[PDB]
Amino acid sequence: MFFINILTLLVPILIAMAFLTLVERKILGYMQLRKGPNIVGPYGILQPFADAMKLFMKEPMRPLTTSMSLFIIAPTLSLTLALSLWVPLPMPHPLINLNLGILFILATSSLSVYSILWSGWASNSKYSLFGALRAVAQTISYEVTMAIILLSVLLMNGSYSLQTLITTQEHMWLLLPAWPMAMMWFISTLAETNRAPFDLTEGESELVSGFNVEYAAGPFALFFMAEYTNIILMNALTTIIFLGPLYYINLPELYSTNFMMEALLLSSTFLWIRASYPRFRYDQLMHLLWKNFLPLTLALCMWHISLPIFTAGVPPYM
Amino acid sequence: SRAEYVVTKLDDLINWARRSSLWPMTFGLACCAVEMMHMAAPRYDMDRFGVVFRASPRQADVMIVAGTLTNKMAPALRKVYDQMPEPRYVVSMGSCANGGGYYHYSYSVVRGCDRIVPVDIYVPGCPPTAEALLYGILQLQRKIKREQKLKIWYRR
Amino acid sequence: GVVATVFGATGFLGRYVVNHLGRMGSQVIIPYRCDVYDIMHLRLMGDLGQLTFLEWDARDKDSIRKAVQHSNVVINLIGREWETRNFDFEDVFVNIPRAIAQASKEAGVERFIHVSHLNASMKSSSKSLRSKAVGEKEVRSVFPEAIIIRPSDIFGREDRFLNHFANYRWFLAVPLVSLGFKTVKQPVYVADVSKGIVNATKDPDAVGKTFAFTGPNRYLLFHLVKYIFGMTHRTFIPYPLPLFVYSWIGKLFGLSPFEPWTTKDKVERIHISDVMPTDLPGLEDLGVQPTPLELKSIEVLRRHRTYRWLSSEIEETKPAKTVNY
Amino acid sequence: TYKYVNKKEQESEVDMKSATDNAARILMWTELIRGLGMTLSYLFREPATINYPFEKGPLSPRFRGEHALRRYPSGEERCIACKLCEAICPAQAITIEAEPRADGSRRTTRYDIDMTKCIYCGFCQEACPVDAIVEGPNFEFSTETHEELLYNKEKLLNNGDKWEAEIAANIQADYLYR
Amino acid sequence: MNLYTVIFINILLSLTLILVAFWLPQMNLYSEKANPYECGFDPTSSARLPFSMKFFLVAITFLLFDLEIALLLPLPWAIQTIKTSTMMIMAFILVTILSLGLAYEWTQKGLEWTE
Amino acid sequence: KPIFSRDLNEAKRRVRELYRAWYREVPNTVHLMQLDITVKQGRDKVREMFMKNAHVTDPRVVDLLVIKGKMELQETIKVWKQRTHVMRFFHETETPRPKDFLSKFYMGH
Amino acid sequence: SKVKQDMPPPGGYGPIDYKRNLPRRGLSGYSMFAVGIGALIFGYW
Ligand SMILES: CCCCCCCCCCCCCCCCCC(=O)OC[C@H](COP(=O)(O)OCCN)OC(=O)CCCCCCCCCCCCCCCCC
Ligand SMILES: NC(=O)C1=CN([C@@H]2O[C@H](COP(=O)(O)OP(=O)(O)OC[C@H]3O[C@@H](n4cnc5c(N)ncnc54)[C@H](OP(=O)(O)O)[C@@H]3O)[C@@H](O)[C@H]2O)C=CC1
Ligand code: SF4
Ligand code: SF4
Ligand code: SF4
């Protein structure tokens, strides 16, 4: 039965990513005044499956200059962590209730960068090394402030467990008390998922392709599935932390539906941003995060250390 | 009905995948790349047919030779064609690429990209209309539809 | 003014034959059964109208007649290293060559060039070689002036020889019968064989004869495999293994529905020692100066190396020891 | 006459209201939201893409497409082996050999155009004195082989017979401009 | 157990995808295809050559800031204390020390990339 | 009038310096570009190309030849010239035609 | 028959707008920050 739950979690997530690719292409097309896919099946709903079959049936590459072990581990690790991060998410009940679910999320997402690093370094290609080092810089930029943002908002939740956010936001979104932190969290997630305007680890205009320039067929498909699974996961995490959906002990499905609607809206906002803005420069990203987010992030962290004490609103433990 | 029938249906699925998703390599040499850009543009929108560009040759299927191939460029064109993983197809758009075009009798032009790589489709024109290139892509899709690799394997 | 029908163009040697014919400027007819995608590499081997691709089937003799209709020369390169579910060694090396030869004779082709094998003997331990001898006899019966070419092992980029041996790295150690010794190999270069066939397409003296295309040097299998692994800077761990166990391993590997990695007949032919020239003409008769393996092994073996050894000079490997038997 | 696209305006406009407006712009991402609003506006417009195979773009009577050789209404061919077409072709795609026909007429025995060598310029059809060689409105004549793109006299005449109505209509519409 | 099971299942799904990707397609291998990529021209040098880092100082600063996060993370449990005055003083002092370090690096031009 | 070298002796000094440079660079070229030739073959080719111009006697022409050879040397030192461009010095696609009168009579005119 | 040739209409065409128009936002700044602070204080309470 736990296996049935594993399936009912994983398979819908994979299908959601598969059709998020199509939704991205169509939203971009319409915002750009074109239609997007609409031949491959009704309105193009078979496009993701066509692409997956084509990619997995295309010949896979074993370049002579690569280190095969890391070259092949990196995509596997990418997809593994992409899927694993979904495990502790409450919706409203997690598949795996963890006391430190948020730290689990942080550690797993941080480890996920090593997929890009090792793939780029094992490609033994100059553009791949460029992409790997840009991933290094991006991680340095955003990881420092993401943790402090999470701590600042968790000083109101009272614990690291994700499931406690549902009862913290039982009467009001955490966005309202901490919308300034919500904005920086949103930008940090945008940078973490390697998405535009921070789409630098794979920057077609500057690097033909970034880390995954020597990757063809199935390994490339693994990378591109991990990316969109992470996009959906991060938007869901925002939806749960801030934008707390409705929870009634007798109506778990209402929480499920509200969460799905809000996460869908936020993912569509990701695609909207990608269609709107131009790209950053991988030094400008670090300068932004270190000269406009870190100062204000520290200020708000100390503000939220003070707030419970001087309002006598210290959260309960357990 | 028969294992032959099952194999034919499987190969039809194979070709459906390949022809529905074919990713041309971001590659353009001269004027004709402008008409390729216009076929990308909203009015025709290649993406509607599932044809999206990719910069890396490792993540491309069809190479659209769009413009004059010179002697200084031919080795690089062959290298990117080779580095494309199989299966891979070639559409030579424009007169420069079909044959020699205006510069056929020049000391620095390869008289036809088919002298360097085996071409799958030829699109006449100087430049061909964006609709003409789209027609060429459709013809390539029909070619992919009539493949029967698995049926050949089973008979073999 | 040559019009040549190449019946095995879509192969390891057929591509070289077609390439050299196109360079000579003679019209070429390629009868194919594979997918159209598999002939794209031949597509660019000839100028406009020089090459004519037509579909054919070994069963249907109308296709064979159509292929050999307007041809002055018919080169037969048909072959296969394993027995297909539909085609076996007997069919591949006797029935199809005989049918092609008879169709060519009826049409009226001036020259017929059949490719067999150096060790093709009626008493050979190998099923393929035993069938090849019968194929030679039947071809020379139904087309009495047909030229016969008997190459030794052919090595090239797309070969099943140097590549086959270098692929033993996937199995850690190299099993050999008698540890390689008591086995003499004389590999020839694919370009040399193709040049020989093309030249025989016009050499006046070649009609009705039998040639033996063999490389310049003869190596013991042990020294040859040692040289191959030295070129592909891999660890050579040879060890002996009796032929019956080797044949069982080949039987196991020959059960794949696709292209087997190895087979009973493949190991048999690997381990049967090449013969000596013995009064047969050879390449120098047709004017091809055989190219030693030492010069052209790098272009075949450089892709089997790891990054460390990718950029190593041809002179960094000790040349094998050539016997004089 | 000139204008400054980007010229400094002032470096002393200080009042609380301006400072706070600039701070709000920086901290609230006003122009970024404006760009998002523009894209959102575009999302709700009718896309300009056309259903190409079943809906083609406009084309003028002067569109230079696939070549064709025309006939007189009586079925006679207009070509009289001028070789002005051949002489003017900038890309040297035309190759003509003519003989005095059995009628005693000046007619071509072979007329080949290398469509992989032609730059589709129309100089041939504007130099032809009898409107014999034309560029019809066909733009969909791609092939799977190179040799199919070497047109001969029979191919060109078949194209002319196939598109005669449309070619004649285009010439009727445009000839007064010529 | 419910976590080991799901993690192992994810690993096995990824590994099965890799196995299918490598053992399904028809493969044609040669040196020209398997060579490294660089815009159609052969690389002029190995990719293993030193690749200068212009933000090394910011990286070694990020290490210390990450340890600062380590020190700051126990705050949810810390605020549950009866010595709230001491906890607040300590948290404020730590955050202000971190801010002073960042400001000093900023002023001394450590956050600027090397050229 | 002198382009560089006043006389044939100075021109020869420049030529010999160029030969030294090419001889030194051949091994690095082979190793870097992964050519399927030997250092002996590369240096033999360098000698053959140098000797192909041994008939020249004008110092100005020798200076031009040395300048163009230096240009090729720079192009090879840097990997601007690729393996396909370097293997053209060997003409391993040419089937030599004979110089025999009767052979020429048989083939063509 | 008098000449019939493409020419502008009698009088001429209507004027063309080419000069940039980019209307400016009406949001003040004080109002934006006031909304932000009000939301913050309400949430804190
Ligand atoms: C009551 C007492 C206590 C009160 C405490 C409260 C005090 C009030 C605090 C107000 C501040 C709110 C927090 C806003 C943080 C913004 C940080 C910032 O200043 O922006 C940095 C950057 C501006 O760029 P720049 O001009 O270079 O700035 C430096 C100039 N030398 O701007 C950027 O970062 C933009 C670059 C990234 C753009 C990404 C695209 C985002 C698109 C819009 C997203 C909209 C949705 C966001 C909501 C998400 C919700 C989950
Ligand atoms: N080491 C060597 O390579 C040696 C080769 N030879 C001989 O040279 C000849 C060429 O073999 P090679 O080309 O090197 O290896 P291949 O196996 O590539 O030759 C196979 C050729 O035969 C064709 N073929 C196989 N079965 C059939 C069939 N049933 N009906 C029609 N055509 C068929 C193949 O067409 P497709 O592949 O498209 O089906 C291909 O063109 C063979 O006779 C071989 O024994 C001689 C000495 C040694
Ligand atoms: S074929 Fe014509 S339009 Fe295309 S690049 Fe060549 S000259 Fe330009
Ligand atoms: S095409 Fe026109 S100009 Fe040329 S020969 Fe024919 S009729 Fe005369
Ligand atoms: S359109 Fe121009 S280039 Fe083409 S055949 Fe006519 S004259 Fe020659």
Short mmCIF file of C-alpha atoms and ligand atoms in Angstrom, two decimals, chain B residues 156, chain C residues 7-14 33-34 38 56-58 76-81 84 87 92-93 96 115-118 132 150-155 160-161 266 269, ligand 2:
data_model
loop_
_atom_site.label_atom_id
_atom_site.label_comp_id
_atom_site.label_asym_id
_atom_site.label_seq_id
_atom_site.Cartn_x
_atom_site.Cartn_y
_atom_site.Cartn_z
CA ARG B 156 16.11 -9.59 -41.84
CA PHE C 7 25.36 -6.18 -54.66
CA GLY C 8 26.79 -5.64 -51.17
CA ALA C 9 27.35 -1.90 -51.22
CA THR C 10 25.64 -1.27 -47.87
CA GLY C 11 28.42 -2.83 -45.83
CA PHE C 12 31.97 -2.51 -44.53
CA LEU C 13 33.63 -3.16 -47.91
CA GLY C 14 30.78 -2.10 -50.17
CA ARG C 33 17.23 -3.99 -49.01
CA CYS C 34 17.94 -1.96 -45.86
CA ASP C 38 21.17 3.33 -44.15
CA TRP C 56 15.86 -5.53 -54.26
CA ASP C 57 15.14 -8.82 -52.54
CA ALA C 58 17.22 -11.99 -52.67
CA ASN C 76 29.02 -9.45 -55.54
CA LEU C 77 29.89 -8.51 -51.95
CA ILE C 78 26.90 -10.21 -50.28
CA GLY C 79 27.76 -11.83 -46.96
CA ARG C 80 27.04 -12.07 -43.26
CA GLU C 81 28.90 -13.27 -40.16
CA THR C 84 19.85 -15.02 -39.76
CA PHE C 87 19.05 -16.45 -44.27
CA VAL C 92 24.09 -16.19 -48.14
CA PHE C 93 27.22 -17.76 -49.65
CA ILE C 96 22.27 -15.78 -53.58
CA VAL C 115 34.47 -12.13 -53.13
CA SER C 116 35.05 -15.23 -51.00
CA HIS C 117 37.73 -15.63 -48.31
CA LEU C 118 41.38 -16.62 -48.11
CA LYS C 132 32.16 -20.14 -49.24
CA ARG C 150 39.87 -14.24 -51.57
CA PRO C 151 40.72 -11.54 -49.03
CA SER C 152 42.25 -12.38 -45.69
CA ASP C 153 40.97 -10.54 -42.62
CA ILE C 154 40.05 -6.95 -43.51
CA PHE C 155 40.70 -4.19 -40.98
CA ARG C 160 34.63 -6.55 -37.17
CA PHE C 161 38.29 -7.40 -36.55
CA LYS C 266 33.29 -16.21 -35.54
CA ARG C 269 37.48 -18.24 -38.01
N1 LIG H 2 36.78 -9.41 -42.42
C1 LIG H 2 35.98 -9.15 -43.52
O1 LIG H 2 35.26 -8.15 -43.50
C2 LIG H 2 36.06 -10.08 -44.62
C3 LIG H 2 35.10 -9.96 -45.56
N2 LIG H 2 35.09 -10.80 -46.64
C4 LIG H 2 33.87 -10.94 -47.45
O2 LIG H 2 33.57 -9.71 -48.04
C5 LIG H 2 32.14 -9.63 -48.22
C6 LIG H 2 31.63 -8.38 -47.54
O3 LIG H 2 31.28 -8.69 -46.26
P1 LIG H 2 31.33 -7.18 -45.38
O4 LIG H 2 30.55 -6.29 -46.26
O5 LIG H 2 32.83 -7.04 -45.19
O6 LIG H 2 30.53 -7.42 -44.03
P2 LIG H 2 28.94 -7.09 -44.27
O7 LIG H 2 28.32 -8.07 -43.34
O8 LIG H 2 28.77 -5.62 -44.06
O9 LIG H 2 28.48 -7.48 -45.79
C7 LIG H 2 27.11 -7.58 -45.70
C8 LIG H 2 26.49 -7.19 -47.01
O10 LIG H 2 25.67 -8.25 -47.49
C9 LIG H 2 24.34 -7.75 -47.57
N3 LIG H 2 23.44 -8.85 -47.22
C10 LIG H 2 23.53 -9.73 -46.14
N4 LIG H 2 22.54 -10.63 -46.10
C11 LIG H 2 21.76 -10.31 -47.21
C12 LIG H 2 20.59 -10.88 -47.72
N5 LIG H 2 20.01 -11.95 -47.08
N6 LIG H 2 19.99 -10.40 -48.84
C13 LIG H 2 20.62 -9.33 -49.42
N7 LIG H 2 21.74 -8.68 -49.06
C14 LIG H 2 22.30 -9.21 -47.93
C15 LIG H 2 24.26 -6.58 -46.55
O11 LIG H 2 23.25 -5.77 -46.86
P3 LIG H 2 22.45 -5.10 -45.37
O12 LIG H 2 23.68 -5.09 -44.51
O13 LIG H 2 21.91 -3.75 -45.83
O14 LIG H 2 21.46 -6.20 -45.15
C16 LIG H 2 25.64 -5.96 -46.76
O15 LIG H 2 25.61 -5.17 -47.91
C17 LIG H 2 31.54 -10.89 -47.52
O16 LIG H 2 31.36 -11.88 -48.46
C18 LIG H 2 32.65 -11.25 -46.56
O17 LIG H 2 32.67 -12.60 -46.22
C19 LIG H 2 36.25 -11.52 -46.96
C20 LIG H 2 37.22 -11.68 -46.06
C21 LIG H 2 37.12 -11.11 -44.70
#
